[PDB]
Design a protein around this ligand. Structure first.
Ligand SMILES: *O[C@@H]1[C@@H](CO)O[C@@](CO)(O[C@H]2O[C@H](CO)[C@@H](O)[C@H](O)[C@H]2O)[C@H]1O
Ligand SMILES: *OP(=O)(O)O[C@@H]1[C@@H](O)[C@@H](O)CO[C@@H]1O
Length: 491
């Protein structure tokens, strides 16, 4: 039989419902269970896992009709794992008001509306033809449909179970099907030999949580795991000393950050947020912890934005004396401020925090670490500072500044950021404008306001480091996922 793949992972999602699984740890599992209409081919034209090319997947072809609609022709006789044939009805349900973006969808997918485009209801023309559309102009439908928002779920099965139970017993069209989920311990998938695309090359995949990275490394060295995730560049020398192991790393389209609970009195105003931001010496963290491999962006601005990336933008500010003055002007009294982290779910989370605590002591702010267990996120009102990350999930600047930090987003609605009205007006403008000078300048003004307000502080794009047995052939992609289609072989 084919070899079973054993992965030692940093964490596991709380649900395998594909939108609710959006996180650093969910896509590497839900990418196997499900498919999208259009897939990003990271290896197109020989690229080393960072190509942006969009290719047919569950849609054999597609055509943009106008500024707000795209018609998809579906591949025929594709089956879900439970035997049901994929049709336009499943695709329409996936992108419906009911399941995803309407007010009724909040109880199934809490972030569905905030992360979605301004969709109108899909139009089904026939069993294999469906149009996705927006109420207002959107040139983002194709990048949205290739993203992690857009894995296709089975309508009747999903409605029968509901989103919570579906998340514990998922059914998709992908190359691996669900076996078991032991919350906070493992996920096991098995080969779907009825798959429509490249046939699965592992017989089974096990995602085993190993929360401590030292234990994870020891497990690779002992022969317990084939691939391990979420290492730091500081682990590269030891792993690569073993002739039968190696590291495989890449910059990913994600940024690490810290952010604030702006419902808390000390963070309602921008002054102390800005003071903490101005004291972070990012290049010294990149040198000390990342062996130079992480990348520090010029604001909320990344190359994968394409036409809305600004390569002439100045670096984010670093000014210890201005930071000291802001601490004084804020009235901060020396009381300790907590910073919550789920151990090293993020690579270098605790080492980075320890360095930042020292940087903050030098401006007169006392920050203390508080840890929380995998899957035990604290009550919001017990949090002040916390770490987070955002995957830059479109080939456009809309994500993640608008979905996360916009007026309909969680940073304003849940976490209390009182954004300037100008910022929210610009979010609405960029959503509907085509690319050009106006949209480009609007994102730059949004970036400036973001730095002025500091609702979050961007640290860097991580250099994502995996380690693997040399006899397990698999290349990383420039995103917070693992791809095995035509990218997994043994021997
Ligand atoms: O970025 C993660 C975000 C995603 O919603 O929530 C956090 C908060 O700790 O993680 C939680 O959700 C993911 C996905 O279900 C789980 O894997 C974590 O264990 C859980 O804490 C962010 O890390
Ligand atoms: O795993 P985590 O950083 O919490 O996941 C984020 C998610 O919360 C959203 O911001 C999109 O980017 C990541 O997956």
């Amino acid at each position: 039989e084919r070899r079973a793949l054993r992965l030692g992972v940093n964490g596991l999602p709380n649900s395998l419902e594909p939108v609710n699984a959006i996180s650093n740890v969910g896509p590497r599992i839900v990418n196997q269970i499900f498919d999208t209409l259009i897939a990003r081919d990271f290896f197109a034209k020989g690229a080393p896992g960072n190509a942006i090319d969009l290719v047919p997947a569950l849609a054999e072809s597609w055509e943009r009709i106008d500024e707000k609609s795209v018609r998809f022709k579906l591949r025929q006789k594709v089956m879900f794992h439970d035997g049901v044939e994929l049709t336009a009805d499943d695709v329409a349900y996936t992108f419906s008001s009911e399941r995803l973006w309407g007010p009724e969808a909040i109880k199934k997918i809490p972030l569905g509306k905030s992360y979605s485009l301004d969709f109108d209801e899909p139009v089904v023309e026939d069993k294999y033809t469906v149009t996705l559309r927006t109420k207002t102009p959107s040139y983002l439908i194709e990048t949205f449909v290739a993203s992690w928002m857009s894995r296709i779920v089975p309508k009747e099965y999903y409605k029968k179970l509901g989103a919570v139970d579906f998340g514990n017993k998922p059914v998709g069209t992908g190359p691996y099907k669900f076996v078991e989920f032991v919350a906070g311990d493992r996920v096991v998938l098995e080969a779907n030999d009825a798959y429509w695309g490249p046939k699965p090359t592992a017989s089974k995949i096990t995602y085993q949580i190993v929360a401590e990275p030292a234990t994870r490394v020891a497990g690779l060295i002992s022969g317990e795991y084939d691939i391990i995730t979420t290492l730091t560049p500081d682990d590269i020398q030891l792993i690569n000393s073993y002739p039968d192991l190696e590291t495989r790393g890449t910059l990913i389209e994600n940024f690490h950050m810290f952010t604030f609970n702006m419902n808390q009195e000390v963070f309602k105003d921008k002054k102390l947020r800005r003071a903490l931001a101005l004291a972070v010496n990012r290049p010294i963290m990149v040198e000390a912890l990342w062996k130079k491999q992480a990348s520090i962006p010029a604001g909320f601005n990344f190359p994968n934005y394409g036409e809305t990336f600004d390569p002439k933008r100045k670096a984010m500010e670093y000014n210890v004396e201005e930071a000291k003055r802001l601490v004084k002007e804020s009235g901060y009294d020396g009381t300790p401020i907590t910073y919550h982290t789920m151990g090293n779910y993020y690579a270098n989370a605790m080492p980075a925090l320890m360095m930042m605590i020292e940087m903050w002591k030098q401006i007169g702010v006392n920050v203390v670490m508080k840890t929380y267990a995998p899957g035990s996120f604290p009550p919001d009102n017990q949090t002040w500072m916390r770490n987070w990350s955002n995957g830059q999930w479109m080939t456009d600047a809309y994500a993640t500044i608008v979905p996360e930090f916009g007026p309909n987003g969680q940073v304003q609605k849940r976490w209390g950021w009182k954004a300037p009205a100008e910022f929210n007006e610009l979010c609405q403008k960029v959503t509907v404008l085509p690319n050009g000078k106006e949209r480009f300048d609007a994102y730059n003004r949004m970036r400036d306001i973001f730095e002025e307000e500091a609702p979050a502080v961007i640290l860097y794009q991580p250099y994502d480091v995996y380690a693997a047995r040399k006899d397990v052939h698999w290349k990383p992609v420039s995103f917070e996922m693992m791809e095995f289609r035509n990218n997994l072989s043994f021997g």
